[PDB]
RNA sequence: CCCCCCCGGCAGCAGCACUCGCCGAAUCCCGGGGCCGAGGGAGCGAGACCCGUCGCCGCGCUCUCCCCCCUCGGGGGGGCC
RNA sequence: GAGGCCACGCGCGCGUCCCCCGAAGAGGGGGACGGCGGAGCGAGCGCACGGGGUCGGCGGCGACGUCGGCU
RNA sequence: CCCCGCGGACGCUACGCCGCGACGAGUAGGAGGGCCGCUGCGGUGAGCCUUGAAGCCUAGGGCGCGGGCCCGGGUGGAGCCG
């Protein structure tokens, strides 16, 4: 037996969009490839934002 | 451009091979120098004791600066302070071993977890056996076996430790980067002591196994791994 | 396992080969010296017992 | 090219040479042997013959496969060892020296005492407890399944024939060419035949082993007897 | 028999006359029994084609020349400044 | 001056130290070390304690009686 | 400038495939997955079926950790399933 705690083992985060939008899934494929094969952290941020929900992607006003 | 690119790849491979050869020669000579240092220290202790006895005085050796700590009791019914100190020593399992740099703070922690551990002062042979047979690195939070020197070099080369011999030297003679070298090592997962223990529930000085046995930790290690 | 696998130990520490070779040569020399010294002691005993 | 030389680095322990890198450099004289600078036709042209068939034909060897299976198996990795049985080193127990009396533990010659002659290329022992004594011909046996006793005869300076090899003693079979389905019994030839060559070899070996057996008293009686376990005796307490 | 000698000498030496230790960078060699064999495209090279006998590591021989010791070209050694 | 070890082995020029004569203790002649200086390349066989097992080893037995099927 | 060879395994349902490391108790309770199961509806299988559907029986052969499922034999006689 090992003296560890298992309540925080599974990190709760989006690994994919919960949406079934096929266009969104295609561009998630594109940015998954770009984030994997480039060192640009911008691609990583964009991919994790694509995974997000609508409340986590609020609309941006023109102003 | 085919001949030119062949020349380019041959030159690159040859430069890489020469670099590997130079690094291997450096590793060999560092190990030789470490051997010289070890025998110098071992003979120096004997010589100092001899001159003190010739003069009729007493030579008190330096208090040991390295300890090996083995957790001997299990994980059931442990008080919170003992549990916390064992976690800070990285002994979360029975028959787990860890090298500890000895000072006031570490010794007081060892006193706190005294009933749960057996600790002592390992010798050069014990350090060699532990690192070579059961040495695993914490590389990218993974337990990776130390099967190549490149694994040590990629994680500790910024500190000058680039081989098994450098790691063993830093562990044995407690160097400047002992904390980094020791935390790089995964805690040793030792077997059950072959031949059994005396009594895990009492102290070593009262016929048991817990607490500080001075240099009998080497006997324990030989039976342990 | 190094300490059991010679080439694995040499991969991790190339100086182990020269240490091991020096140890083997030294042990052979010391064994020969002790054997010769014991044989000389036995021959001296034979001479001092059958010196006539 | 030059004549191959001996190793010049004597082995003192397996994997370790007696001399160091610089010592072997000086022994090899690498200081002056320094060097800086300086197929098979796949297709064959054949005259096809016949008028206006062109000149010749460029016929390739190893034509491409006619058929491909629906799926294959990936090739294995590489193991840097695992030599074939013919290249294995053959180990012999120190108690088995030429002329030792052995005890057979398995087979139809179970419990018989035979004479050891030599180890063969496969590590199998060649024995002949002489056929006039206990009906054991020149025959192979396995050193794992024998007991080496302490009694020995000096079978030095006797001539074991050179053709007595593993290929010589290998079993022979008849079945099964020109026959696929068994409606008529192919049980013929099942009577193994002792070859005249085998009889000649047996006579030649025994004619020079027997006088040395008769040289010591009642060893022939010992070889005629078979080994057995009496109810009082135990193999771990027995000196062989 | 015990102690001090004016002082010892020889051999051995934690003894292969089993009295009493701690050890191994001051440590190596060999052997036996048991359990196991997971993985499966490792080729920067020829532009591969018989199934990559491959990488790292440790070695040997040749692209130099003399000899030595056994076999009858083969095997085993000393090197060669 | 009648042994052991070295993971020491190309030249040229530069530096550092040592040696000789030193006719200003000038100037040349020699050794040792170098991490210094603009210029491409060793290949060819093997053995293997070398990124997890193979044999280019073998035997016996097989139809109305026996072989295998841990379910 | 490849060519005496015109040639060169598999892969990548990307909701897929592959690698490495650590870990595995569980009531009340929470969550995920279910190519677990029942009934009916929209699509789809140029699906199955009187040369035998459903159901049932079975010392028959198997698959899955499991929920369960497939196939053989019998009975049955008109519908059924992915
Ligand atoms: Mg567990
Ligand atoms: Mg839990
Ligand atoms: Mg308890
Ligand atoms: Mg036991
Ligand atoms: Mg208690
Ligand atoms: Mg001793
Ligand atoms: Mg396998
Ligand atoms: Mg659970």
Coordinates of C-alpha atoms in Angstrom, one line a residue, chain B:
Chain B
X1 CA 24.0 18.3 -55.2
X2 CA 24.0 14.7 -54.2
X3 CA 27.7 14.5 -53.6
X4 CA 27.7 17.7 -51.6
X5 CA 24.8 16.5 -49.4
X6 CA 26.6 13.2 -48.8
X7 CA 29.6 15.2 -47.7
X8 CA 27.4 17.3 -45.4
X9 CA 25.8 14.2 -43.7
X10 CA 29.2 12.4 -43.4
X11 CA 30.8 15.5 -41.8
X12 CA 27.8 15.9 -39.4
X13 CA 27.9 12.3 -38.3
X14 CA 31.7 12.4 -37.9
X15 CA 31.5 15.5 -35.7
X16 CA 28.8 13.8 -33.6
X17 CA 30.9 10.7 -33.2
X18 CA 33.9 12.8 -32.1
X19 CA 31.7 14.6 -29.6
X20 CA 30.5 11.3 -28.2
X21 CA 34.1 10.0 -28.0
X22 CA 35.3 13.2 -26.2
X23 CA 32.4 12.9 -23.7
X24 CA 33.1 9.3 -23.0
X25 CA 36.8 10.0 -22.4
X26 CA 35.7 12.8 -20.0
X27 CA 33.4 10.4 -18.1
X28 CA 36.2 7.8 -17.9
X29 CA 38.7 10.3 -16.4
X30 CA 36.1 11.8 -14.0
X31 CA 35.5 8.3 -12.7
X32 CA 39.2 7.7 -12.3
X33 CA 39.6 11.0 -10.4
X34 CA 36.6 10.1 -8.1
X35 CA 38.3 6.7 -7.3
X36 CA 41.5 8.6 -6.3
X37 CA 39.4 11.0 -4.1
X38 CA 37.6 8.1 -2.4
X39 CA 40.8 6.2 -1.5
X40 CA 42.3 9.5 -0.3
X41 CA 39.4 10.1 2.1
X42 CA 39.4 6.5 3.3
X43 CA 43.1 6.5 4.0
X44 CA 43.0 10.0 5.6
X45 CA 40.5 8.9 8.3
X46 CA 42.8 6.0 9.2
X47 CA 45.9 8.2 9.2
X48 CA 44.3 10.8 11.5
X49 CA 43.2 8.1 13.9
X50 CA 46.7 6.6 13.9
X51 CA 48.4 9.9 14.6
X52 CA 46.0 10.7 17.4
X53 CA 46.7 7.3 19.0
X54 CA 50.4 7.7 18.6
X55 CA 50.2 11.1 20.4
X56 CA 47.9 9.4 23.0
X57 CA 44.9 11.6 22.2
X58 CA 41.6 10.9 20.6
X59 CA 40.6 11.7 17.0
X60 CA 36.8 12.3 16.8
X61 CA 35.7 11.7 13.2
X62 CA 33.4 14.2 11.5
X63 CA 29.8 13.6 12.2
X64 CA 28.2 11.9 9.2
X65 CA 26.6 14.2 6.7
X66 CA 24.7 11.5 4.7
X67 CA 22.0 9.2 5.9
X68 CA 19.9 6.4 4.3
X69 CA 16.4 6.2 5.7
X70 CA 14.2 3.2 5.1
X71 CA 10.5 3.2 6.1
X72 CA 9.8 0.0 8.0
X73 CA 6.2 0.4 9.1
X74 CA 3.1 0.4 6.9
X75 CA 0.5 3.0 6.1
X76 CA -2.3 2.0 8.5
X77 CA -3.1 4.1 11.6
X78 CA -0.4 6.8 11.3
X79 CA -0.6 10.0 13.3
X80 CA -0.9 13.2 11.1
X81 CA 2.6 14.6 12.0
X82 CA 4.4 11.3 11.3
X83 CA 2.4 11.0 8.1
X84 CA 3.4 14.5 7.0
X85 CA 7.1 14.1 7.8
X86 CA 7.1 10.7 6.0
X87 CA 5.6 12.4 2.9
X88 CA 8.2 15.2 3.2
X89 CA 10.9 12.4 3.3
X90 CA 9.2 10.8 0.2
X91 CA 8.6 7.6 2.1
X92 CA 5.0 6.8 1.2
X93 CA 5.4 3.0 1.1
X94 CA 7.0 0.4 3.4
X95 CA 10.6 -0.5 2.4
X96 CA 11.2 2.7 0.6
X97 CA 14.6 4.3 1.0
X98 CA 15.8 7.8 0.6
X99 CA 19.1 9.6 1.0
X100 CA 18.9 12.4 3.5
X101 CA 21.4 15.2 4.0
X102 CA 22.0 15.4 7.8
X103 CA 21.7 18.7 9.7
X104 CA 19.6 20.0 12.6
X105 CA 16.3 20.2 10.7
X106 CA 16.6 16.8 9.0
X107 CA 17.7 15.1 12.2
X108 CA 14.8 16.5 14.1
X109 CA 12.4 15.3 11.4
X110 CA 14.0 11.9 11.7
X111 CA 13.5 12.0 15.5
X112 CA 9.8 12.7 14.8
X113 CA 9.4 9.7 12.5
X114 CA 11.8 7.5 14.6
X115 CA 9.4 4.6 15.3
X116 CA 8.5 4.3 11.6
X117 CA 12.0 4.3 10.1
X118 CA 15.3 2.6 10.3
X119 CA 18.1 4.9 9.2
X120 CA 21.9 5.0 9.3
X121 CA 25.1 6.1 7.6
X122 CA 25.6 4.4 4.2
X123 CA 29.1 3.6 2.9
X124 CA 30.4 4.0 -0.6
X125 CA 29.5 0.4 -1.5
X126 CA 25.9 0.8 -0.3
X127 CA 25.6 4.0 -2.4
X128 CA 27.0 2.2 -5.4
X129 CA 24.7 -0.8 -5.0
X130 CA 21.6 1.4 -4.4
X131 CA 22.2 3.7 -7.4
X132 CA 23.2 0.9 -9.8
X133 CA 20.7 -1.8 -9.0
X134 CA 17.6 0.3 -8.1
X135 CA 18.4 3.8 -9.3
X136 CA 15.5 5.4 -11.1
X137 CA 15.3 9.0 -12.2
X138 CA 12.3 11.4 -11.9
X139 CA 12.3 12.6 -15.5
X140 CA 9.3 14.6 -16.6
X141 CA 7.5 13.3 -13.5
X142 CA 8.0 9.7 -14.7
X143 CA 10.0 6.9 -13.0
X144 CA 12.6 6.1 -15.7
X145 CA 15.3 3.5 -15.1
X146 CA 18.9 4.9 -15.3
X147 CA 19.9 2.8 -18.2
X148 CA 21.9 5.5 -20.0
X149 CA 24.1 8.4 -19.0
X150 CA 22.2 10.7 -21.3
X151 CA 19.2 10.4 -19.0
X152 CA 21.2 11.9 -16.2
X153 CA 22.9 14.4 -18.4
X154 CA 19.7 15.9 -19.8
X155 CA 18.3 16.5 -16.4
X156 CA 21.3 17.3 -14.2
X157 CA 24.1 18.4 -16.7
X158 CA 23.5 22.1 -15.8
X159 CA 24.8 21.2 -12.4
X160 CA 27.8 19.3 -13.7
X161 CA 26.3 15.8 -13.0
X162 CA 26.5 13.9 -16.3
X163 CA 26.9 10.2 -15.4
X164 CA 26.3 7.5 -12.9
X165 CA 29.6 8.3 -11.3
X166 CA 28.9 12.0 -10.9
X167 CA 25.5 11.2 -9.4
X168 CA 27.1 8.7 -7.0
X169 CA 29.8 11.2 -6.1
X170 CA 27.3 14.0 -5.4
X171 CA 25.2 11.6 -3.2
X172 CA 28.1 10.2 -1.3
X173 CA 30.1 13.4 -0.7
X174 CA 27.2 15.8 -0.1
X175 CA 27.9 18.4 -2.7
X176 CA 26.5 21.8 -3.6
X177 CA 23.8 20.3 -5.8
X178 CA 22.9 17.4 -3.4
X179 CA 19.3 18.6 -3.2
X180 CA 18.9 18.5 -7.0
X181 CA 20.7 15.2 -7.4
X182 CA 18.8 13.5 -4.6
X183 CA 15.4 14.8 -5.7
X184 CA 16.2 13.6 -9.3
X185 CA 16.3 10.1 -7.9
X186 CA 13.0 8.3 -7.4
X187 CA 12.8 6.9 -3.9
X188 CA 14.3 3.4 -3.8
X189 CA 11.7 0.6 -3.8
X190 CA 13.6 -2.0 -1.8
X191 CA 12.5 -5.6 -1.3
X192 CA 11.7 -7.2 2.0
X193 CA 14.7 -7.8 4.2
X194 CA 16.0 -11.3 3.3
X195 CA 16.5 -13.1 6.6
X196 CA 13.8 -11.1 8.3
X197 CA 14.0 -8.3 10.9
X198 CA 14.5 -8.5 14.6
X199 CA 11.5 -6.5 15.8
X200 CA 10.0 -3.7 13.8
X201 CA 8.0 -2.3 16.7
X202 CA 10.9 -1.4 18.9
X203 CA 14.1 0.6 18.7
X204 CA 17.4 -0.8 17.4
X205 CA 19.2 -0.2 20.7
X206 CA 16.6 -2.3 22.5
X207 CA 16.9 -5.3 20.2
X208 CA 14.5 -4.1 17.4
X209 CA 14.8 -2.4 14.1
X210 CA 13.4 1.2 14.4
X211 CA 15.6 4.2 14.9
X212 CA 19.2 5.1 14.2
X213 CA 21.6 2.2 13.8
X214 CA 24.9 3.9 13.2
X215 CA 26.5 1.9 10.4
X216 CA 24.5 -1.4 10.5
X217 CA 22.3 0.2 7.9
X218 CA 24.8 -1.2 5.4
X219 CA 24.0 -4.7 6.6
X220 CA 20.3 -3.9 6.3
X221 CA 20.8 -2.6 2.8
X222 CA 22.7 -5.7 1.7
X223 CA 19.8 -7.9 2.9
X224 CA 17.3 -5.4 1.7
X225 CA 18.1 -5.0 -2.0

